[PDB]
């Protein structure tokens, strides 16, 4: 009551709140001023990245548990620390000259690997942070570049307008969907053009989301420690994708005549501090 402050040019302003609701006040609009390599050992499967390589820690935050301060569940059964933390390796996509790009959808891309698809198949809720590590074996005469990006909530538009999308075309089971350098003509598939990144945004503007570059000159691999990002604290993993990887080569790979032409790319994700709630004797499928 009877407050006095400053304004952006003595000069002041005395505004009072005449209402009994916090959402009825005005807007605030004022500020009060042979060699050494590191080895991540998580679960029982290690990696070897580099000594000199940076590791991007998500949106600044490390993946952590959901404390009692911000829980809305009723009862909380156990979360495993060894059983689902291993560096699970997915299928190896093959990089060629005219390769467009690849994507994944990770809450529905680990359903077969280990017990991570054997805990979320029973419990109703779910929460896990991820530690993606994508690698390609380099050489000094194999120029080319790569961009990885973990876009969260990557709503993808359908190929034909006034249609929805189908779950068989949005995600795949073990394979990464290609990113046609042209336009898909499908009636129910996804609009998978590469210069719009599926969501309709400019594909150069995918650098806000945690991103790393796998430039074949000065980098061999890339590791993004993505945190669990969702509005609700807990949501089911079978009808919701938390984020989406996108591996789009900005510069095509150009080898020479007497050089290898079967350069692979693997992804080696690992769920960190995976929590579950609501055990129901379901056994989903």
């Amino acid at each position: 009551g009877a407050q006095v402050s400053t304004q952006k040019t003595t000069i002041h302003y005395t505004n009072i709140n005449y209402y009994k609701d916090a959402a009825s006040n005005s807007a605030n609009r004022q500020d009060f001023t042979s060699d050494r390599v590191r080895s991540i050992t998580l679960g029982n499967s290690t990696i070897t990245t580099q000594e000199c390589a940076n590791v991007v820690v998500g949106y600044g935050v490390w993946p952590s548990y959901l404390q009692d301060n911000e829980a809305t569940a009723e009862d909380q059964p156990t979360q495993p620390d060894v059983a689902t933390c291993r560096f699970y390796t997915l299928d190896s996509i093959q990089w060629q000259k005219e390769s467009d790009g690849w994507w994944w959808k990770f809450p529905e891309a680990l359903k077969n690997m280990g017990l991570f698809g054997q805990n979320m198949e029973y419990h109703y809720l779910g929460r896990s942070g991820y530690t993606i590590h994508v690698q390609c074996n380099a050489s000094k005469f194999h120029q080319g570049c790569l961009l990885v990006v973990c876009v969260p909530e990557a709503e993808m538009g359908c190929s034909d307008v006034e249609r929805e999308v189908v779950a068989a075309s949005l995600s795949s089971e073990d394979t990464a969907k290609s990113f046609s350098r042209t336009e898909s003509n499908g009636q129910h598939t996804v609009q998978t053009v590469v210069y719009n990144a599926g969501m309709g945004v400019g594909v150069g503007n995918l650098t806000i989301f945690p991103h790393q570059w796998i430039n074949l000159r000065t980098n061999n691999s890339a590791t993004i420690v993505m945190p669990y990002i969702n509005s609700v604290p807990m949501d089911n993993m079978f009808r919701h994708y938390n984020f989406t990887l996108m591996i789009i080569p900005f510069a095509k790979l150009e080898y020479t005549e007497q050089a290898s032409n079967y350069v692979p790319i693997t992804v080696t994700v690992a769920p960190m501090c995976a929590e579950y709630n609501g055990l129901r004797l379901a056994s989903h499928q």
């Binding site: 709140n17 005449y18 209402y19 009994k20 609701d21 959402a23 009825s24 006040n25 005005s26 807007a27 609009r29 998500g58 949106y59 600044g60 935050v61 911000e70 000094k140 005469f141 194999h142 120029q143 080319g144 570049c145 350098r181 590469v194 210069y195 400019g202 594909v203 150069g204 503007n205 650098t207 806000i208 570059w213 430039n215 074949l216 000159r217 000065t218 945190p227 990002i229 969702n230 509005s231 604290p233 900005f250 510069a251 095509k252 150009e254 080898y255 020479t256 007497q258 050089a259």
Partner: protein, 238 residues
């Protein structure tokens, strides 16, 4: 009671106001606060993240992905200009759909220092030097390297380091230049010239691809707010 007088400004609906109003949901408690990561505070923090700029924005190339890759062929040139663009962050075709431009296009006035970081995507064995020069508005665009050398420039050794960065300086008559720059309140041309010529060994491919990342330096500011002349509609879309 109190004998007030209604001043001019009564019974109006100015949009950019700050007035109180009675609540439609009284005594309505909210859901408690959660710490979603990435809580942005100011909009300019999106204009501090690099976004690739389509430097090769030719007519055939723009539709294709090959509009972001700038050619750096290897051979004896010593006159060829790899790229040149007026440094107009708002109207220029090169920077307008980039993240810096999109936030900037919302705001009418721009003041700060842009940073262009040019990465080299090429074989490890390749080595070359390039002179990137910001020529201030002065008179005419640089057309030969000797003309570019006078203006502020950085020599980048592709072999010693990839990702050389040029922080284009803010030299201007006025504190703020309009995003729709006119001949007055305009900005100088930026250009890149070969210094030694790329030297690529027999085992590696001669051609290489260089890409450009543009993000504002810390001292960037916006002054007004306006409709974006990029998106439109026709009817109430349903």
């Amino acid at each position: 009671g109190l004998p007030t007088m209604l001043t001019p400004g009564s019974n109006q609906f100015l949009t950019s106001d700050d007035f109180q109003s009675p609540s439609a949901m009284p005594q309505f408690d909210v859901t408690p606060e959660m710490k979603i990561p990435g809580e942005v505070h100011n909009l300019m923090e999106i204009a501090e993240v690099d976004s690739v700029v389509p430097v090769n924005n030719t007519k055939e190339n723009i539709n294709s992905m090959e509009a972001y890759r700038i050619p750096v062929t290897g051979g004896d040139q010593l006159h060829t200009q790899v790229f040149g663009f007026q440094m107009q962050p708002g109207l220029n075709s090169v920077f307008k759909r980039t993240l810096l431009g999109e936030i900037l296009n919302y705001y009418a006035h721009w003041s700060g220092s842009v940073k262009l970081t040019f990465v080299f995507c090429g074989s490890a064995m390749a080595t070359g030097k390039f002179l990137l020069a910001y020529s201030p508005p002065g008179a005419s665009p640089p057309q030969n390297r000797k003309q570019a050398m006078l203006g502020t420039h950085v020599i980048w050794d592709v072999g010693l380091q990839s990702s050389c960065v040029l922080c284009i300086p803010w030299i201007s008559q006025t504190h703020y230049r309009l995003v729709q720059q006119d001949e007055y309140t305009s900005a100088g041309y930026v250009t890149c010239w070969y210094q030694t010529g790329l030297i690529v060994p027999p085992g590696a491919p001669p051609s290489c691809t260089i890409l450009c990342f543009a993000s504002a330096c810390n001292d960037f500011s916006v002054r007004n707010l306006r409709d974006t002349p990029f998106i439109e509609q026709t009817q109430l879309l349903q």
